[PDB]
Design a protein around this nucleic acid. Structure first.
Lengths: 15, 91, 92
DNA sequence: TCTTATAAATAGTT
DNA sequence: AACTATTTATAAGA
């Protein structure tokens, strides 16, 4: 699930 | 190469695309070699002038990204500035 | 080099560490040159054998990851398999 | 870390 | 797409 990986990456970097 | 070039933006669109493809392959090939020689996992993200995304991963980009998020801190972090400085100290 | 090496795992721990530091610099330097010559934004993530994290970004690792997440799909996606294949085709 | 001999990448023609 | 002289990278030594 690249969309999940991208969304987890998004939340990490942003936080 | 037949002549030394300066590290500066290539303005000729065609020269840029040709260099881009050659050097992109060269960089991925070095990454391939490093990953095998020293048992490493590597991910590369490239956005060209036209903002088209190119990516490479020794094995799995997603896994590498997932792993990245589990580290609060990079064990080493460099930018162009860092590389430019290292080169200065060596001419 | 003083000799051709085969592209194969290095077993001597110290040889591995030395090669690693050297080629890592060499990888980042190629990325630097590409990013300037061709106006690319680049991020690179390396986990060495002990899963230490090393990273490089032309300008900003955070910007580039954030950009990546906004793109639905890559225009090109390569792996070691693909690189091996290109080499086979390229021949000698 | 440095040096260096040598292997490998590549800029410029082709 | 090719080729190759030339630049660059690096393995082994020190």
């Amino acid at each position: 699930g690249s969309g999940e990986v991208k969304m987890k990456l998004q939340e990490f970097v942003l936080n | 190469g037949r002549k030394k070039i300066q590290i500066q933006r290539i303005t000729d669109e065609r020269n840029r695309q040709v260099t881009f493809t050659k050097r992109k392959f060269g960089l991925m090939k070095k990454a391939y070699e490093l990953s095998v020689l020293c048992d490493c996992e590597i991910a590369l993200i490239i956005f060209n002038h036209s903002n088209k995304l190119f990516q490479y991963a020794s094995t799995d980009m997603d896994k590498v990204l997932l792993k990245y998020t589990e580290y609060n801190e990079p064990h080493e972090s460099r930018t162009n500035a860092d590389i430019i400085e290292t080169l200065r100290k060596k001419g």
